[PDB]
């Protein structure tokens, strides 16, 4: 549309496009997650719930391979039973909503695999810096 050619606009703007197009615009959805006599309690619990959710996400990233790299290749493989689709098709064919509907079952095992991979990389790096 207006943002054709130079593919960007405001946050949640890429939510309709395919995930390959939406992957180039991730900094703003990361950005619009933190900043934004009894009603002060409501304002305060909203603000601390926002920073608690953001800190939980940053801690979930920080125990994995990437602290703030925002795109992280890692060392765990991919079971093809989970996706069971053509690989380059999903980046030109699927929205992130539809993809999250697809792998709703296949969740929370990936995160433990990531933690095992990161702890294995840490003990391997400890051994490597130990014998040197």
């Amino acid at each position: 549309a207006v943002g054709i050619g130079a593919v960007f606009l405001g946050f949640l703007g890429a939510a309709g496009s395919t995930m390959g197009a939406a992957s180039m615009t991730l900094t703003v959805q990361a950005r619009n997650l933190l900043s934004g006599t009894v009603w002060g309690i409501k304002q305060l619990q909203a603000r601390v719930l926002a920073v608690e959710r953001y800190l939980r996400d940053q801690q979930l990233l920080g125990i994995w391979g990437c602290s703030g790299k925002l795109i992280c290749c890692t060392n765990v493989p991919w079971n093809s039973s989970w996706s069971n689709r053509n690989l380059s098709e999903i980046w030109d064919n699927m929205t992130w909503l539809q993809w999250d509907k697809e792998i709703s079952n296949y969740t929370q095992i990936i995160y433990g695999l990531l933690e095992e991979s990161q702890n294995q990389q840490e003990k391997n790096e400890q051994d490597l810096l130990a014998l040197d």
Partner: antibody
Amino acid sequence: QVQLVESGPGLVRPSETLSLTCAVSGASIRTKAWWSWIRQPPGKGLEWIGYVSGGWDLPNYNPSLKNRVIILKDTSLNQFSLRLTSVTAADTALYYCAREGPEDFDVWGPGFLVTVSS
Amino acid sequence: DVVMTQSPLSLSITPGQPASISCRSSQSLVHSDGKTYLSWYQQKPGQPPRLLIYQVSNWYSGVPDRFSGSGTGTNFTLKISRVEAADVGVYYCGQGVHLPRTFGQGTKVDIK
């Protein structure tokens, strides 16, 4: 005082996805424990299928089960479920949910005969 | 994996007389702390088994002291110094120190 009770089929066709679910009362799931599945073919010895943990251990199975077993815990319902994809009629066995603790498998389930038949 | 063997495979008990099962594991079950993760079970038909002795010197809650257990290396020993009619079933020797968990074959025990 822990009580484990299995639930699910006992008669399924081969080459299908088998799934049981054991309910747990008398204690909590997220304990120093491995909520485990152990089977026994009829007239034969036991066969340990695998476990899951109430902490954050990754579940570790018997490699003879050919990576078709996914035990999934349900802490919001105090349960933990066996899975077995692509079953055969030779997989007919009594199934048991149990709890490894500081002692070895104190409270079992009653154990139900899953007779895989076509 | 760990291989378990019980000897004898069948022993019809004489009431008033002891009985024994020698367990043989394939590998050393003594963990580096100093303990031994070995357990004994007793098959009842269509039932969860009855549990006699875990961690050989230790005792289950719910087990009378008319049993006994010892052992060296991989040769462990369950003994019943006074058998009863309540000792029906087919026993088990099962390790717990190595993944994967394994169990045994068992000793057949009936009335003589």
